[PDB]
Amino acid sequence: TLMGNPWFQRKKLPSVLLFKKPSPFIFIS
Amino acid sequence: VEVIFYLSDREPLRLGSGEYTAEELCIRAAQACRISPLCHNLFALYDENTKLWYAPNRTITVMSLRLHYRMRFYFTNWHGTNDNEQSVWRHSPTPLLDASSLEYLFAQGQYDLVKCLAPIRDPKTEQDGHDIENECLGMAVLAISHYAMMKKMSYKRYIPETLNKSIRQRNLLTRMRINNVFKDFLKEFNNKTICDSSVSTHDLKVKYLATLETLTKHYGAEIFETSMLLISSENEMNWFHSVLYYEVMVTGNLGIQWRHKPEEWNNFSFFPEITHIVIKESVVSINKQDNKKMELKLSSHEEALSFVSLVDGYFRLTADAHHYLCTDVAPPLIVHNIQNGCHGPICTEYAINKLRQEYVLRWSCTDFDNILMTNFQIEVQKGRYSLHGSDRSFPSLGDLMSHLKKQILRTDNISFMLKRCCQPKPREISNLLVAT
């Protein structure tokens, strides 16, 4: 089979491309 | 004979006939790459052919020889983005690297990753392997993104060649797949992540190198092999004497460690504990303060010089900026500076403080052709020393000083004379030293 290998798993963003941020939030009405 | 840089826009330094030392070629290299006087000692010349480093004092005479300007000395997590690992910093009266060194290290890192001098770690499982490959795609995305970002604007040339050859062995559909996945990563990164996480070029280089620290084997470490190893103290004697069977690893954070070649590494010593190092032919003998010692037989005198250069450099980086552990690898500048009671590129604050405690001579933090006297500029032009603004030079700093001490120095509304020099003291703290 052509697709019977790990590269046809669902894409997952490499953690090397994960630049975390604090992302605090506030609810203002 | 030429010195190569991992920076692309920098053409290589070609040398004519004559004698040079690795140190002054490193000075020239540093000036060419805008490397600061502060970071200069982090670099060294590497022969990619013989796979050996040059000691600072090694003489080169001109044939055809390709040497590489490499950042040699390294401290894992210098970047500080690893919340688990140790923290590294320069003392203040402050990060390790400046922008120049960072850029060069980034370029060098890319080079190492692609040419596989930084070999990718072995997979624990098939899944882990695939994850590694994915990370490599990520690294490619980082590299390309950075390039595009720098100039204000295929993954194949940005991943390890091994993985490239591996991928080239898979069916065409899978290769199309890898292309698509990579394109999606790149697009999603540049369109969303750059803006959302406000990713600068700095952060990018940092994450790249930080990732190299965990993606590849023994990054920033130097491993030397031997079949004749001796560790001896007042408590133990371990004599290993069987192809090579034993490994001695050198790193900035952990120092000198050793093990049987495939065991967990055994700690022999951190650098400030070392008193001195002796070389005889290929045999290296390292001595600690408590008289515990290591002896090992390397494959040549050159490799010995390489090893001891590494250890001596780290000692200079972590223990005493104005000292050397072995005459055979003694840097000319450290020697001449010891002889002339002159400091390395310390901050002016340290100089002031040292004056408060008890003039001071120190190399400039900005450029290599100047010695700051505490603030007044002294110029060093091609072996000759002179006061800035004057037109009379001397064959050495000492003669200049001798002549200088006899003068009445005038500044705006003030007159005085040089008195005495507060030369460097053993193992004193300064920004020249890396705290770990």
Side-chain angles (χ1 to χ4, degrees), chain B residues 349-352 354-356 358-384:
Chain B
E349 300 90 293
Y350 282 109
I352 287 155
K354 201 155 187 293
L355 287 164
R356 293 197 198 186
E358 315 294 354
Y359 64 93
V360 171
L361 289 173
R362 54 187 184 87
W363 285 94
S364 164
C365 317
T366 66
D367 61 321
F368 293 81
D369 300 322
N370 286 273
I371 296 172
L372 295 174
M373 181 177 65
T374 311
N375 283 323
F376 306 111
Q377 268 177 208
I378 291 187
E379 302 197 64
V380 191
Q381 296 179 309
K382 314 202 185 203
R384 301 197 75 78

Side-chain angles (χ1 to χ4, degrees), chain B residues 120-186 188-191 193-312:
Chain B
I120 53 173
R121 65 182 188 80
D122 290 337
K124 301 180 174 63
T125 63
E126 289 185 343
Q127 189 58 54
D128 191 37
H130 182 252
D131 295 336
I132 290 162
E133 299 190 349
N134 216 251
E135 288 303 320
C136 290
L137 288 179
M139 293 288 274
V141 168
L142 282 195
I144 293 162
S145 302
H146 185 267
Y147 172 87
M149 218 180 301
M150 223 66 176
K151 285 323 292 176
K152 322 87 177 182
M153 314 194 333
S154 175
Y155 69 88
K156 290 189 172 186
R157 280 170 255 270
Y158 304 95
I159 63 167
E161 294 170 337
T162 52
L163 175 56
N164 208 267
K165 190 184 73 170
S166 174
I167 292 165
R168 288 223 178 94
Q169 234 60 48
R170 318 210 67 159
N171 60 42
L172 299 177
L173 186 67
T174 302
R175 295 176 73 165
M176 285 192 178
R177 171 63 183 183
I178 295 165
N179 279 337
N180 295 344
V181 167
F182 168 76
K183 289 205 292 292
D184 193 271
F185 289 170
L186 182 63
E188 181 175 343
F189 183 72
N190 284 266
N191 285 10
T193 312
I194 293 293
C195 312
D196 288 25
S197 298
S198 186
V199 185
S200 63
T201 60
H202 186 271
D203 302 331
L204 215 164
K205 293 188 279 289
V206 167
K207 183 141 289 174
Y208 190 93
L209 302 162
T211 299
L212 283 185
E213 291 181 350
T214 65
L215 178 64
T216 65
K217 305 179 178 177
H218 302 301
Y219 189 67
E222 292 201 16
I223 300 169
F224 306 80
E225 296 180 21
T226 182
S227 61
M228 291 184 181
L229 176 66
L230 170 69
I231 299 95
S232 75
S233 76
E234 59 191 74
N235 301 127
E236 297 190 2
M237 170 175 170
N238 305 278
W239 184 20
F240 307 102
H241 57 77
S242 72
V243 58
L244 303 171
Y245 293 91
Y246 319 104
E247 290 184 333
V248 178
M249 180 168 62
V250 184
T251 65
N253 287 120
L254 297 318
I256 297 175
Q257 306 176 292
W258 63 271
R259 71 176 184 172
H260 288 76
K261 188 175 186 189
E263 185 188 2
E264 284 293 352
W265 297 93
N266 301 111
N267 294 319
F268 170 78
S269 184
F270 197 48
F271 304 104
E273 325 313 320
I274 303 176
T275 63
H276 65 302
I277 297 173
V278 178
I279 301 170
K280 173 134 202 316
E281 302 296 346
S282 303
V283 176
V284 180
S285 185
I286 314 153
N287 302 272
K288 301 179 68 179
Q289 285 171 348
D290 57 6
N291 301 118
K292 180 178 185 193
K293 67 176 291 185
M294 170 182 289
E295 272 202 35
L296 64 151
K297 187 182 71 171
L298 294 161
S299 63
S300 72
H301 184 60
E302 301 81 286
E303 189 175 28
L305 295 165
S306 189
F307 175 86
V308 177
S309 310
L310 190 63
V311 179
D312 196 33

Side-chain angles (χ1 to χ4, degrees), chain A residues 8-22 24-27:
Chain A
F8 291 84
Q9 289 174 15
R10 205 69 181 165
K11 300 190 301 89
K12 198 158 198 64
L13 199 77
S15 64
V16 58
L17 299 176
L18 288 175
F19 292 77
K20 80 196 197 328
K21 283 313 190 155
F25 58 107
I26 304 187
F27 280 91

Side-chain angles (χ1 to χ4, degrees), chain B residues 304-352 354-356 358-404 406-411 415-418 421-424 426-430:
Chain B
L305 295 165
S306 189
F307 175 86
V308 177
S309 310
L310 190 63
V311 179
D312 196 33
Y314 278 122
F315 180 90
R316 214 166 299 113
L317 282 174
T318 64
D320 193 337
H322 314 92
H323 197 260
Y324 62 93
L325 298 175
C326 181
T327 302
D328 294 33
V329 302
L333 200 62
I334 279 56
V335 169
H336 289 99
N337 285 342
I338 285 165
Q339 289 174 339
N340 285 268
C342 185
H343 299 84
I346 56 176
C347 293
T348 177
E349 300 90 293
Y350 282 109
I352 287 155
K354 201 155 187 293
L355 287 164
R356 293 197 198 186
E358 315 294 354
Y359 64 93
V360 171
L361 289 173
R362 54 187 184 87
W363 285 94
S364 164
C365 317
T366 66
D367 61 321
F368 293 81
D369 300 322
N370 286 273
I371 296 172
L372 295 174
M373 181 177 65
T374 311
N375 283 323
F376 306 111
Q377 268 177 208
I378 291 187
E379 302 197 64
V380 191
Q381 296 179 309
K382 314 202 185 203
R384 301 197 75 78
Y385 300 70
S386 74
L387 191 66
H388 177 57
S390 179
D391 199 81
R392 180 183 186 179
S393 68
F394 300 83
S396 64
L397 178 59
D399 299 78
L400 172 64
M401 291 297 101
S402 300
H403 176 262
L404 242 58
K406 290 159 38 162
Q407 297 276 353
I408 299 169
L409 296 181
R410 287 208 209 176
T411 193
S415 305
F416 67 90
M417 303 197 96
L418 287 175
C421 178
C422 303
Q423 57 189 24
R427 297 174 171 265
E428 62 186 350
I429 301 294
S430 77

